[PDB]
Ligand SMILES: O=S(=O)(O)c1cccc2cccc(Nc3ccccc3)c12
């Protein structure tokens with residue numbers, strides 16, 4: 312202390328965070344491997360600093376641990392605990408068989424615990440996706456690559472106007488809701504739940520309107536009965552096609568009534584009816600939840 316970038320030997324690139332590249336590095340002084348995320352861009356809004364401070368305050372088993380923050384010439388290096396496996400990579404490695412239900416249950420349960428914690432502390436993730444959910448050898452899964460309400464740094468990814476971060480975006484956001492809620496995270500997680508089960512992304516759209524239509528084609532085009540206020544949302548258009556809701560026996564074939572009940576509550580159109588992370592933890596689907604260790608080729 313202080314830690315200096317020169318104190319770290321870079322080992323290998325681990326991944327591509329939305330706001331910075333992440334490298335596996337070794338602390339030359341302690342031998343401890345860590346994960347370093349470099350963030351590169353002037354001003355930083357007061358609201359920005361406050362949200363970052365709130366996130367930094369969080370200490371939870373299911374949120375990747377930030378160990379230090381090193382400042383150096385317009386650069387910022389976030390020193391995190393080292394992890395190098397994520398749900399996306401894991402699901403792909405397990406594509407020709409799928410993740411075992413016990414592990415699906417465990418991961419979903421843990422993500423809900425992490426989210427419940429964030430939400431009670433006024434913190435939202437806003438950009439949940441398989442790629443940013445890190446897993447370790449002992450079976451934990453952790454939230455990472457948090458999104459941002461107000462910018463200040465630099466977005467290093469590309470997915471933006473592409474075909475990825477949109478796949479998990481809540482409909483209220485796509486329809487132009489200015490003030491959204493913690494419900495947007497539950498929606499993303501519900502999409503991830505379906506994905507772990509079917510082994511395919513639930514709504515892989517390529518544009519905001521395409522994302523909306525894919526959602527509509529599956530859950531039915533929402534109306535005032537199902538979602539009070541929907542027809543007055545900023546970007547709602549009466550010209551939207553009207554699709555009927557599909558049965559979950561078709562949408563997520565492998566799930567039973569308990570799984571379907573939980574998924575339906577996580578994908579409820581109305582944010583005011585969508586299950587909270589806290590309430591989801593008490594859902595019967597998690598009665599037999601355990602903490603299985605994943606089989607990784609590490
Ligand atoms: O609050 S810090 O712990 O530094 C921090 C931690 C993690 C991410 C950050 C992103 C942008 C600005 C920061 N703050 C900042 C403040 C002053 C100068 C330069 C950057 C961030």
Ligand SMILES: O=S(=O)(O)c1cccc2cccc(Nc3ccccc3)c12
Nearest residue numbers: 325326327328333346391394397455456
């Ligand atoms: O960038 S984040 O995910 O926010 C991240 C945050 C904190 C620690 C990380 C450690 C290794 C890899 C990451 N990223 C990563 C990138 C691409 C794929 C999988 C993981 C880490």
Ligand SMILES: O=S(=O)(O)c1cccc2cccc(Nc3ccccc3)c12
Nearest residue numbers: 330350363366367375377455456457464
């Ligand atoms: O990297 S993340 O995995 O999101 C992350 C994970 C855990 C704690 C964090 C604390 C402050 C900032 C982060 N990220 C961040 C980076 C750049 C801009 C704004 C926030 C934190």
